[PDB]
Every structure is written in structure tokens, then in C-alpha cells.
Symmetry: C3
Subunit: 25 residues, 3 copies
């Protein structure tokens, strides 16, 4: 897959883990 | 070893493992 | 912005959150 595609996928994922975080801690 | 591409690789590895450990912290 | 800054910002975020998880497990 493309770097453009991969980069986007990781920016959102980090964003998702951050929200799972926020709801706990 | 340090192109945007090689570093992307590392950052997705870290993200992958981090996402699992996370299932142990919360849903 | 650029692909470089975007990768930097994401490394930045991943790093901050790893230290937060490292405290727990």
C-alpha cells in the first residue's frame, strides 16, 4: 500500500487510541 | 534507515503493539 | 502540511502516548 494511504491510517489510529484513553483516564 | 518511509514503518509497528496492549487497558 | 511534518507530528503523538501506557502496563 501507498505511503499516503499508510500515513493517514496511522494518524487516525493514534487519534482513536487517544479517545479510548480519554474515556478511561 | 531514516527516510520518511523507513520511519513510517517503525511508527506503524509501535502503533500496532500499542493498540493490543490497549485492549488490556480498556475497550 | 508537508509529508515530513505530518510524520513528525505523528511520531510526536505516538511517543507521548507510549509513555502514558508504559506507566500502566
Amino acid at each position: 500500500n501507498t505511503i499516503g494511504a499508510r500515513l493517514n491510517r496511522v494518524e487516525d489510529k493514534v487519534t482513536q487510541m487517544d479517545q479510548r484513553m480519554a474515556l478511561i483516564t
